[PDB]
C-alpha cells in the first residue's frame, strides 16, 4: 500500500520480507519488481556461502568446462 | 574515488521559482533544460554504475570461519568487527571518520554504506580462505600459509623460504597492518583525493546557488519584487534578463558536472581494474599494485571511494 | 571432450545472441543518444527565443531591415546557443567513445593477439583465447576461458619429512586421499608418486610447521 523508504516514500507497492536481485532501482538498498502486483524489497547481494577452512584442508578440481562469453565495446 | 554525490537540479523551480509568467517566458527558449535534466539524471545513474562495477564483482557472499587461526597472520584490522553497530573493520571506521532549497535535490546512492561493507567483507573472506581461485570459478579452500607460498613462488622466490620464515613473515605483516592504521589516524591529509571530489561538488553547488542573487542587469535579483512592482508589459523585460542569466549559469554548472563525471568514471574504471587484478589475483605489472613485487591486496570501503592495502 | 565443449559453448553463445534483444544494448544506447541529440538540435529551430516568429522568411517578408534586425539577432543568439550546447555534448561523448575504443584496441591486442595473465581482463576465468567479431559501430569479443569444476576435499601438508630432510613440491602440491600421499598439479587432480624428481630438499624437519612423515621414492634404488 504505502511504504516509507530513505529515498522518499513509495505508493502503490507492497513491502515484503523477501529479498531478490534488484530489478528496478529505487535507492538506499530498496528495489522494486513486478511479480501479481508491484513489490518493494531490500536487494540481496548474492547467495550466502561459507567455504570450509582448516589449516590442512585443500580443494583441487578434478574436471573442467570451457566457457565462451561475449564482451561488446 | 569511485563515485560522487548524485545531484538533481530542476529548471522551473531554479530559474523561475513558482512564477507562472516566468515559466511562460521560459517556454520560448525551447527544450534547453529538458536536456539539462536529462544530463544530470544520466550522471546520477552513472554514479551507481561506477559503484556496481567496483564493488559488485563477486557473486556469493563468503564468510570467514568462526575460529580465526591463519598460521600467525591475523586480519583483525581488516575483518568486520561485530562489536560495533556498523559491521565495519576498524580501518574502515577510521576512514569513515576522517572524511568530512532552490530546486536542488540529492539522490541517495543505490548501495548503502552497509551493503558496500558487506561486499568488501565478502571479497576479504574470499581472498583469505581461497586465494585467487574464487575470482576464476568455484572457491577452493587453501591453507593461508600454503597460499602465501604460492604467492611467493609467483615472484621468483622458492616456497621453502616462506615455510622457513613463516612466523617472521607473519610478524612483519601484522606490524605493517598496524602501522597503516596509525599512519591514517595521525595524518589528516591522507584522504585528500576523496576530499577533493567532495569539496569540488560542494563549491559548484554553492556557486550555483549564489548566482541566484545576481541582477544580470535587471532592476532586482528577486523575481517576486519585479512581479510586485511592475505590470506584465514592462516586467517581462526584466524577467527576460533574469532568465538569460540563470539559464546560462545552469548550463555552466551542467557542463562542469559532465566533465567532472568523466573524470570520476575514469577513476572508477581504474579502481575496478585494480580490484580485478590486484585483489582477485596476483599481478605481474610493475607498480600497478604498489611498490615492490606484489603479493596480495585487501580492499577497504571509504565514503565515495575505495582504499587498497597492497601487501608487497 | 574439450572440442565438444568448445563447439557447444559457441552454439550456446550464438543462440543467446539470437534469442535476447537486450544483448547489444551498448551500441543501441550510443545510437539512441546521438539520434536524440540530433533531434533536439533540429527541434530547437522552432523556438521564437523572444522573436515575433520562429521562421526567418516570415520575419524577412513582413518587416523592414531596421526593425527586423532585432528579431533576427534574437533568433541568431538562440540558435547559436543551441548549436554550442550540441557541440559541447558531442565533444564529451566523443571523448567517452575514444576511451572505449582505446579499451577495445587494448583488449584486441592483449586477448586476441596473445594470451593474457590479467585477471578478468579477457573474460571470467583463466583466459585461454579470444575471437574478434565485427558489429555495427563496435566490436564483440568471444572470450574462451577455462573454468575448473568438480572439486573435492584433500588433506594437504606443506612438506614431506624423509631421512631427516624436508621435501617441498617442485611444481604441484602434496595431497592425501586418506591413507597415502601424492603430489598433484594445483589446477587439476592428477596424483603421482612422491619421488625425488618432482620434489626438492631444503633443510631438516625442525623448521617447517605441519610437516608430516612419508616415504620419498628414489628412481635409482631399483638398479
Ligand atoms: C568432465 O566433464 C564432462 C562434461 O563437462 C563430462 O562428460 C560427460 O560424461 C558423462 C559420463 O560419460 C556423459 O554422460 C556426458 O554426456 C558427458 N558430457 C559431455 C558434454 O561430454 C566428463 O565425464 C567429466 N569427466 C569426469 C571424469 O567426470
Ligand atoms: C590480532 O592483532 C590485534 C591487534 O589489534 C590484537 O588485538 C588486541 O590484542 C591485545 C592483546 O594482545 C588486546 O589488549 C587488545 O584489546 C586487542 N585489540 C582489539 C581491537 O581486539 C589481537 O589479539 C591479535 N590476535 C591474535 C590471535 O593474536
Ligand atoms: C588412496 O590411494 C591408494 C593408492 O592408489 C589406494 O590404494 C590402492 O587401493 C586399491 C583398492 O583397494 C588397490 O587395488 C591398490 O593396490 C592400492 N594401491 C596401493 C599402492 O596400495 C587407496 O585405496 C586409496 N585410499 C582411498 C581411501 O581412496
Ligand atoms: C615422524 O618421524 C620422526 C622420525 O623420523 C619422529 O620423530 C621421533 O619422535 C620421537 C618422539 O618424540 C622421538 O623419540 C624420536 O627420537 C624421533 N626421531 C627422530 C629421528 O627425530 C616423529 O615423531 C614422527 N612424527 C609423527 C607425527 O609421528
Ligand atoms: C518483515 O519482517 C519483520 C521482521 O522483523 C516483521 O516484523 C514485519 O512484519 C515483516 N513485514 C511484513 C509486511 O510482514
Ligand atoms: C569438504 O568437507 C566440508 C566439511 O564441512 C564440506 O562442507 C564440503 O562440502 C566438502 N567439499 C567438497 C568439495 O565436497
Ligand atoms: C591445525 O589446527 C590444529 C588444532 O589446533 C593443530 O593441532 C594442527 O597442528 C594445525 N595444523 C597446522 C599444520 O598448523
Unique residue bearing C-alpha cell 559548484: B204
Phi, psi of B116 (to 5 degrees): -65, -40
Query: In sequence order, what are the residues at sequence separation of 6 or more whose Cβ sits closer than 8 angstroms to the Cβ of residue C93?
Result: C33, C34, C37
Cα–Cα nearest to C136, from C24, C44, C219, C56: C24
Q: How many CB atoms lie within 10 A of CB C77?
A: 14
Element (H, E) at B161: helix B160-164
Unique residue bearing C-alpha cell 584522504: B191
Residue nearest to atom 20 of ligand 3 (CA): C180
Q: What is the DSSP string of B186-246?
A: H-TTTTHHHHHHHHHHHHHHHHHHHGGG--TTSS-S-HHHHHHHS-HHHHHHHHHHHHHHH
Q: Which ligand is nearest to the CA of A13?
A: 5
Q: Can you read off the three cell numbers belonging to residue C181?
A: 600421499
Last residue before each gap in chain B (C to N over 2.5 A): 100
Question: Is the C-beta atom of C213 inside 6 A of ligand 4?
Answer: yes
Q: Can you read off the three cell numbers belonging to residue B265?
A: 568514471
Q: How far is CA B176 from CA B157, C65, C74, in A?
A: 21, 80, 67
First to last CA, chain A: 42
- Interior angle at CA A10, CA A7 and CA A14, nearest 5: 130
* E-state strands within chain A: 2-5, 8-11, 14-15, 24-27, 30-34, 38-42, 48-49, 57-72
Query: In sequence order, what are the residues at sequence separation of 6 or more whose Cβ sits closer than 8 angstroms to the Cβ of residue B286?
Result: none
Distance from C-alpha of A71 to C-alpha of A17, rounded to nearest angstrom: 36
Decide if B70 contacts B177 (C-beta within 8 A). Answer: no
Q: How many whole angstroms from C77 Cα to the centroid of ligand 7?
A: 80
Phi, psi of C205 (to 5 degrees): -95, 30
For residue A69, give the nearest of C124, C152, C184 by CB distance.
Answer: C124
Q: How many whole angstroms from C174 Cα to the centroid of ligand 4?
A: 20
Q: How many whole angstroms from B111 Cα to the centroid of ligand 2?
A: 32
Q: What is the DSSP string of C143-173?
A: EEEEEEEEEEEEEE-S-EEETTEEEEESSSE
DSSP-derived letter for residue B109 is: P
Distance from C-alpha of C143 to C-alpha of C121, rounded to nearest angstrom: 10
DSSP-derived letter for residue B136 is: G
Element (H, E) at B42: helix B32-55
Element (H, E) at B129: helix B113-130
Distance from C-alpha of B69 to C-alpha of B108, rounded to nearest angstrom: 39
Decide if C78 contacts B25 (C-beta within 8 A). Answer: no
DSSP H stretches of helix in chain C: 2-19, 25-43, 56-62, 65-107
Q: What is the DSSP string of B249-297?
A: HHHHHHHHHHHHHHHHHHHHHHHHHHIIIIITS---STTTTSSSS--EE
Decide if C177 contacts C211 (C-beta within 8 A). Answer: no
Instruction: List C156's β-bridge partners, or say none.
Output: C175
Distance from C-alpha of C109 to C-alpha of B23, rounded to nearest angstrom: 54
Unique residue bearing C-alpha cell 565443449: C5
- Cβ-based burial of A72 (10 A; exposed 0-12, middle 13-18, buried ≥19): middle
Dihedral of the alpha carbons of B57, B63, B69, B70, in degrees to the nearest 10: -20
Distance from C-alpha of B2 to C-alpha of B92, rounded to nearest angstrom: 16
Q: Can you read off the three cell numbers belonging to residue C174?
A: 602434496
Q: Can you read off the three cell numbers belonging to residue C46?
A: 522552432
Q: What is the DSSP string of B46-95?
A: HHHHHHHHHHTT-SSEE---SS--BTTB--TTTS--TTSTT---HHHHHH
- Cβ-based burial of B162 (10 A; exposed 0-12, middle 13-18, buried ≥19): buried
Contacts 24+ apart (CB under 8 A), B131-135: B132/B280, B132/B281, B132/B282, B132/C119, B133/C148, B134/A51, B134/B58, B134/B60, B134/B62, B134/B280, B135/B57, B135/B58, B135/B276, B135/B280, B135/B281, B135/C119, B135/C120
Cα–Cα nearest to C209, from C158, C166, C172: C158
Technique employed here was cryo-EM
For residue A53, give the nearest of B65, B110, B122 by CB distance.
Answer: B65
Q: Can you read off the three cell numbers belonging to residue B56?
A: 559488485
Last residue before each gap in chain A (C to N over 2.5 A): 35
Amino acid at each position: 500500500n504505502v511504504f516509507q523508504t530513505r529515498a522518499g516514500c513509495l505508493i502503490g507497492a507492497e513491502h515484503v520480507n523477501n529479498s531478490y536481485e534488484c530489478d528496478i532501482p529505487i535507492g538506499a538498498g530498496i528495489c522494486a519488481s513486478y511479480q501479481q502486483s508491484i513489490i518493494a524489497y531490500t536487494m540481496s547481494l548474492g547467495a550466502e556461502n561459507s567455504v570450509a577452512y582448516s589449516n590442512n584442508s585443500i580443494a583441487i578440481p578434478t574436471n573442467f568446462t570451457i566457457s565462451v562469453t561475449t564482451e561488446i565495446l | 574515488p569511485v563515485s560522487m554525490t548524485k545531484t538533481s537540479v530542476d529548471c522551473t523551480m531554479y530559474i523561475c521559482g513558482d512564477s507562472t509568467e516566468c515559466s511562460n517566458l521560459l517556454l520560448q527558449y525551447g527544450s534547453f533544460c529538458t536536456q539539462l535534466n536529462r544530463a544530470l539524471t544520466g550522471i546520477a545513474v552513472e554514479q551507481d554504475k561506477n559503484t556496481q562495477e567496483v564493488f559488485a564483482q563477486v557473486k556469493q557472499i563468503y564468510k570467514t570461519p568462526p575460529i580465526k587461526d591463519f598460521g600467525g597472520f591475523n586480519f583483525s584490522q581488516i575483518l568486520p568487527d561485530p562489536s560495533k553497530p556498523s559491521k565495519r573493520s576498524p580501518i574502515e571506521d577510521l576512514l569513515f571518520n576522517k572524511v568530512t532549497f532552490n530546486g536542488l535535490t540529492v539522490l541517495p546512492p543505490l548501495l548503502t554504506d552497509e551493503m558496500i561493507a558487506q561486499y568488501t567483507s565478502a571479497l576479504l573472506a574470499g581472498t583469505i580462505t581461497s586465494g585467487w581461485t574464487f575470482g576464476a570459478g568455484p572457491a577452493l579452500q587453501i591453507p593461508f600459509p600454503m597460499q602465501m607460498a604460492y604467492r611467493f613462488n609467483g615472484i621468483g622466490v622458492t616456497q621453502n623460504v616462506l615455510y622457513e620464515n613463516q612466523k617472521l613473515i607473519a610478524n612483519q605483516f601484522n606490524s605493517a597492518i598496524g602501522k597503516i592504521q596509525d599512519s591514517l589516524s595521525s595524518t589528516p591529509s591522507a584522504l585528500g583525493k576523496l576530499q577533493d571530489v567532495v569539496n569540488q561538488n560542494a563549491q559548484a553547488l554553492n556557486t550555483l546557488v549564489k548566482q541566484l542573487s545576481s541582477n544580470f542587469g535587471a532592476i532586482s535579483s528577486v523575481l517576486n519584487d519585479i512581479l510586485s512592482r511592475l505590470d506584465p508589459p514592462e516586467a517581462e523585460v526584466q524577467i527576460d534578463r533574469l532568465i538569460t542569466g540563470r539559464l546560462q549559469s545552469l548550463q555552466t554548472y551542467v557542463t562542469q558536472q559532465l566533465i567532472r563525471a568523466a573524470e570520476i568514471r575514469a577513476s572508477a574504471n581504474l579502481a575496478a581494474t585494480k580490484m580485478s587484478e590486484c585483489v582477485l589475483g596476483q599481478s605481474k605489472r610493475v607498480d600497478f599494485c604498489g611498490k615492490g613485487y606484489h603479493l596480495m591486496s585487501f580492499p577497504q570501503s571509504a565514503p565515495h571511494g575505495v582504499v587498497f592495502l597492497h601487501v608487497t | 571432450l574439450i572440442a565438444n565443449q568448445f563447439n557447444s559453448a559457441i552454439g550456446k553463445i550464438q543462440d543467446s545472441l539470437s534469442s535476447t534483444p537486450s544483448a547489444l544494448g551498448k551500441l543501441q544506447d550510443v545510437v539512441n543518444q546521438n539520434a536524440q541529440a540530433l533531434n533536439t538540435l533540429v527541434k530547437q529551430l522552432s523556438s521564437n527565443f523572444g522573436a515575433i516568429s520562429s521562421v526567418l522568411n516570415d520575419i524577412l517578408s513582413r518587416l523592414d531591415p531596421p526593425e527586423a534586425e532585432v528579431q533576427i539577432d534574437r533568433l541568431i543568439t538562440g540558435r547559436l546557443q543551441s548549436l554550442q550546447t550540441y557541440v559541447t555534448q558531442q565533444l564529451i561523448r566523443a571523448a567517452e567513445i575514444r576511451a572505449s575504443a582505446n579499451l577495445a584496441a587494448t583488449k584486441m591486442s592483449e586477448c586476441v593477439l596473445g594470451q593474457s595473465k590479467r585477471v578478468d581482463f579477457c573474460g571470467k576465468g583463466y583466459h585461454l583465447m579470444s575471437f574478434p567479431q565485427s558489429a555495427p559501430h563496435g566490436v564483440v569479443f568471444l572470450h574462451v576461458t577455462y573454468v575448473p569444476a568438480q572439486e573435492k576435499n584433500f588433506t594437504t601438508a606443506p612438506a614431506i619429512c624423509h631421512d631427516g630432510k624436508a621435501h617441498f613440491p617442485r611444481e604441484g602440491v602434496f595431497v592425501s586421499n586418506g591413507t597415502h600421499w601424492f603430489v598433484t598439479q594445483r589446477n587439476f587432480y592428477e596424483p603421482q608418486i612422491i619421488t625425488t624428481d618432482n620434489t626438492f630438499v631444503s633443510g631438516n624437519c625442525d623448521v617447517v610447521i605441519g610437516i608430516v612423515n612419508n616415504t620419498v621414492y628414489d628412481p635409482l634404488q631399483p638398479e
